[PDB]
Design a protein around this motif. Sequence first.
Motif, PDB file in Angstrom:
ATOM      1  N   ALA A  39      35.828  54.454  21.981  1.00 23.28           N
ATOM      2  CA  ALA A  39      35.578  55.687  23.012  1.00 23.28           C
ATOM      3  C   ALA A  39      34.435  55.490  23.933  1.00 23.28           C
ATOM      4  CB  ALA A  39      35.832  57.085  22.401  1.00 23.28           C
ATOM      5  N   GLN A 167      40.098  63.373  19.348  1.00 18.24           N
ATOM      6  CA  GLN A 167      40.113  62.255  18.460  1.00 18.24           C
ATOM      7  C   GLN A 167      39.838  62.406  17.103  1.00 18.24           C
ATOM      8  OE1 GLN A 167      37.388  59.031  20.568  1.00 18.24           O
ATOM      9  NE2 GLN A 167      35.929  59.841  19.147  1.00 18.24           N
ATOM     10  N   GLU A 168      38.921  63.413  16.794  1.00 15.41           N
ATOM     11  CA  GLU A 168      38.461  63.748  15.425  1.00 15.41           C
ATOM     12  C   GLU A 168      38.567  65.071  14.726  1.00 15.41           C
ATOM     13  OE1 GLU A 168      34.532  61.597  14.986  1.00 15.41           O
ATOM     14  OE2 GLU A 168      34.869  60.114  16.180  1.00 15.41           O
ATOM     15  N   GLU A 211      39.177  55.173  11.852  1.00 19.03           N
ATOM     16  CA  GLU A 211      38.279  55.660  10.948  1.00 19.03           C
ATOM     17  C   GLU A 211      38.572  56.269   9.341  1.00 19.03           C
ATOM     18  OE1 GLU A 211      35.723  58.259  12.912  1.00 19.03           O
ATOM     19  OE2 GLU A 211      35.188  56.608  14.414  1.00 19.03           O
ATOM     20  N   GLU A 295      32.190  68.334  19.026  1.00 14.51           N
ATOM     21  CA  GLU A 295      31.408  67.498  19.823  1.00 14.51           C
ATOM     22  C   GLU A 295      32.321  66.835  21.192  1.00 14.51           C
ATOM     23  OE1 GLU A 295      31.059  63.945  17.321  1.00 14.51           O
ATOM     24  OE2 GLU A 295      30.978  62.716  19.105  1.00 14.51           O
ATOM     25  N   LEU A 343      24.403  63.481  19.167  1.00 13.06           N
ATOM     26  CA  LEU A 343      24.988  62.506  18.309  1.00 13.06           C
ATOM     27  C   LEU A 343      24.438  61.166  18.377  1.00 13.06           C
ATOM     28  CD1 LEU A 343      27.601  62.396  16.467  1.00 13.06           C
ATOM     29  CD2 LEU A 343      28.257  60.588  17.878  1.00 13.06           C
ATOM     30  N   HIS A 373      28.296  56.804  12.949  1.00 11.60           N
ATOM     31  CA  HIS A 373      28.886  55.216  13.064  1.00 11.60           C
ATOM     32  C   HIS A 373      29.507  55.078  14.461  1.00 11.60           C
ATOM     33  CE1 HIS A 373      33.341  57.299  11.933  1.00 11.60           C
ATOM     34  NE2 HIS A 373      32.508  58.245  12.634  1.00 11.60           N
ATOM     35  N   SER A 375      33.624  53.599  15.827  1.00  7.30           N
ATOM     36  CA  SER A 375      34.827  53.497  15.363  1.00  7.30           C
ATOM     37  C   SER A 375      35.098  51.925  14.927  1.00  7.30           C
ATOM     38  CB  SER A 375      35.732  53.945  16.310  1.00  7.30           C
ATOM     39  OG  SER A 375      35.928  53.333  17.311  1.00  7.30           O
ATOM     40  N   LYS A 396      28.061  61.462  10.227  1.00  6.61           N
ATOM     41  CA  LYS A 396      29.420  61.274  10.330  1.00  6.61           C
ATOM     42  C   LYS A 396      29.565  59.703  10.313  1.00  6.61           C
ATOM     43  CE  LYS A 396      31.171  60.992  15.096  1.00  6.61           C
ATOM     44  NZ  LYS A 396      31.977  61.790  16.198  1.00  6.61           N
TER      45      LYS A 396
HETATM   46  O1  2PG Z   1      33.205  59.222  19.558  1.00  6.71           O
HETATM   47  C1  2PG Z   1      32.093  58.927  18.513  1.00  6.71           C
HETATM   48  O2  2PG Z   1      31.215  59.796  18.082  1.00  6.71           O
HETATM   49  C2  2PG Z   1      32.530  57.523  17.724  1.00  6.71           C
HETATM   50  C3  2PG Z   1      32.625  57.451  15.865  1.00  6.71           C
HETATM   51  O3  2PG Z   1      33.667  58.547  15.851  1.00  6.71           O
HETATM   52  O4  2PG Z   1      33.634  56.708  18.168  1.00  6.71           O
HETATM   53  P1  2PG Z   1      33.406  55.784  19.176  1.00  6.71           P
HETATM   54  O5  2PG Z   1      32.829  54.613  18.224  1.00  6.71           O
HETATM   55  O6  2PG Z   1      34.652  55.184  19.734  1.00  6.71           O
HETATM   56  O7  2PG Z   1      32.773  55.997  20.714  1.00  6.71           O
END
Ligand code: 2PG
Lengths: 437, 414
Positions: A39, A167-168, A211, A295, A343, A373, A375, A396
């Motif tokens: 994403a 997403q999470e 994840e 988030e 983040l 991290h 994904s 996270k």
């Molecule tokens: O969206 C996020 O904050 C991250 C990790 O959860 O996802 P991605 O690595 O896909 O952007």
Amino acid sequence: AVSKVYARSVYDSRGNPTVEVELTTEKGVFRSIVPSGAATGVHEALEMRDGDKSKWMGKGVLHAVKNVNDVIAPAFVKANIDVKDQKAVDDFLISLDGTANKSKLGANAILGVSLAASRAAAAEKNVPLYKHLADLSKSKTSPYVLPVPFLNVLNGGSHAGGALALQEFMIAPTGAKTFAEALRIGSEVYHNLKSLTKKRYGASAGNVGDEGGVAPNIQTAEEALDLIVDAIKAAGHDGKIKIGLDCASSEFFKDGKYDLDFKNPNSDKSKWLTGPQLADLYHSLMKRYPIVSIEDPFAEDDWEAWSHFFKTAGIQIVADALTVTNPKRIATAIEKKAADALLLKVNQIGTLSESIKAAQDSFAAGWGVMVSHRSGETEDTFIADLVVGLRTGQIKTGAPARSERLAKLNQLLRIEEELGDNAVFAGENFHHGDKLL
Amino acid sequence: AVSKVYARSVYDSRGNPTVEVELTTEKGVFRSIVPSGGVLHAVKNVNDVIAPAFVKANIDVKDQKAVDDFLISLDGTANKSKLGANAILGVSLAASRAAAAEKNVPLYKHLADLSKSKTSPYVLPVPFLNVLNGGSHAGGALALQEFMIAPTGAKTFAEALRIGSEVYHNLKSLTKKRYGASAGNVGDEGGVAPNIQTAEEALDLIVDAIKAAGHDGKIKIGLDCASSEFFKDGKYDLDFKNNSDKSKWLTGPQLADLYHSLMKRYPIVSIEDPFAEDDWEAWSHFFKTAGIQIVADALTVTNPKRIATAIEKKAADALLLKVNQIGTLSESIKAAQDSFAAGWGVMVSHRSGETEDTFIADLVVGLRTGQIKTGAPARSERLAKLNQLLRIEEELGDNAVFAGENFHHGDKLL
Ligand SMILES: O=C(O)[C@@H](CO)OP(=O)(O)O
Ligand SMILES: O=C(O)[C@@H](CO)OP(=O)(O)O
Ligand SMILES: [Mg+2]
Ligand SMILES: [Mg+2]
Ligand SMILES: [Mg+2]
């Protein structure tokens, strides 16, 4: 003295190539590996892919690797830079490319060198990496602050096959008194969640997303959140576990509106939400669930929706795609009062020093910082040492499943053991871990 | 000299506790993590028993045999049940890493020295990639546990992993298209996990994926039936996760006929645990005409007494090597050496509950076996080993060869 800089292609946790860098010094060979998002925000620094349809379906990093080996490596080695001076390292790397978004060499060429240099420096100094990173960021070390892990135990959106748009769905054991406690009881909630999900939605609903979260084929945030609260309670941890969301709303922003069925190509457009409408949905969840962090509630340039929402939010609001770990975009976000936490994804910006600056800018504004991290992750454990060095109080790095996730969580166990009485667990003070004591 | 031995609890790839051991020498700190298919007690047994005894002893870490004799004699139970095979293994493995660093050599070179293997060229293994997960590793109906692809037709390890990853990604997309998006989510070892009921369904996808990715002729297939997991009341239940209809459970010759029909339709070059773990007769019967590699896992549980029995009875022609089952590095080497001596193959294997540890990557190279299984190219407890093999291949340049179509007898290659 850096005698060698070398890059190779290795595989991330999705089975896609990424860049690994090794820097050689008198103290040995230091390896860092660049992660990769799914994403990704439109404003991220450049992740250079080969686009050769005949190899890895276009996802090769042989060009990035070549840029390290043929361009960065000789310049670096010839320059005779003090790896302890991270700002020097990163000023130099940044000047090799000379574009703000690293479009000439690739962020994924530069970042591995930046990180490996910091590893070499810690070795030269005979200190653990988290100590060196505290030194680089001018952070307090009496006590260190161990983070609350935000564990992504149910995956949706672009991280898992299924209908769920958000997403999470993360649990955060803020009521734990140690990091080891927080990880243990979080792992217990997760195991309960897997059992229960498979009892409710069938055996295949227990298979995992990118994840490590369970991936039930559900349609609503409420059904995800009811499942997670049932697991918190069934594991015996009611009251000690809170919830965080990452909506990744940019992934479902279309033509000014938000599609909560965005992975259905026949999604009913009359059901897409406006910003105000999605805010009402958030407020509803916030009232009904022990949610302490949200988030990317709105899209990456939908500034008015963020600002309007923040006004009445009163929990932590994290900027991810909005800010792209970029001090310039963070300044705009602070100005607009769009959010109150960053983040921090080092590969969005592409150097350790720019990432530290983005954290320092956030703290200076009274924002929190959640180290993260991607994904697409690897065996690399850098971010475990980073979130301790920066004293943020919150990380996270996945469900407690899949070892690109546990590698960081295990490293945190090791750091907590090493620190002993000179570290405290952030617990309920996670938002401002940096000011704790 | 070892100045310190210390254990702690860490989490494996399913989020379950396992044992990590650290050995400290003048060269640094050397870490081994034990995989899993009690942890508190094992950690205590390391810290209260093995650690003081081992440090006092001042054993040469390069002398793996003395290390392991010390550990076995300290435990004093045939099955290592006094101290725990997990407590013992962590110290065994970490000693080998300390030994390599002393020698200023990569670990696989040290392990070749230990097993007295040829280093003339070193042999990089064919990766048997478990791309579609069933049985106890995935939620769903599918009974057989592992459906692996083996890029025996690649020319280098790097190539093998690249074309394997391409097939895997093609599989995921075909699987989501055909069985719905949820089916593309993964099981314990990283394979896609469609809710399907037959091996033909699973094998059909894989062949389509092989074709869609452009790799027909270069990718073969290995199976781990793990038949013991569905061996009930003397029969085989291919719906064992479901109440399954008892009238559809197969006998051994019905199960053997299943395998022959698969063997005809599909480019299968290895089958593991085609029958239950104490059904020597069925194994011995099937083997006489199988004509492909037959791998012993639950049959032999990396035990020398059952391995010798399997050789004599001619029940199989390859051993699955799981270091955590036998509990010391020395014994594992011996197991693989006994196998080679009998003209068998050896497949080095992960466990479904894995960690970020990369020991088995160096081990498969040092033992020169030519074949490893360590997961799908997804989930980093699997990629960490596959990445480690990339590094080894790269480092060795002209001094290494990919086993390719010779994986069965990799140890005899060049
Ligand atoms: O969206 C996020 O904050 C991250 C990790 O959860 O996802 P991605 O690595 O896909 O952007
Ligand atoms: O059966 C096997 O060969 C192994 C490895 O895939 O599985 P487990 O660790 O579950 O025994
Ligand atoms: Mg995000
Ligand atoms: Mg098996
Ligand atoms: Mg060949």
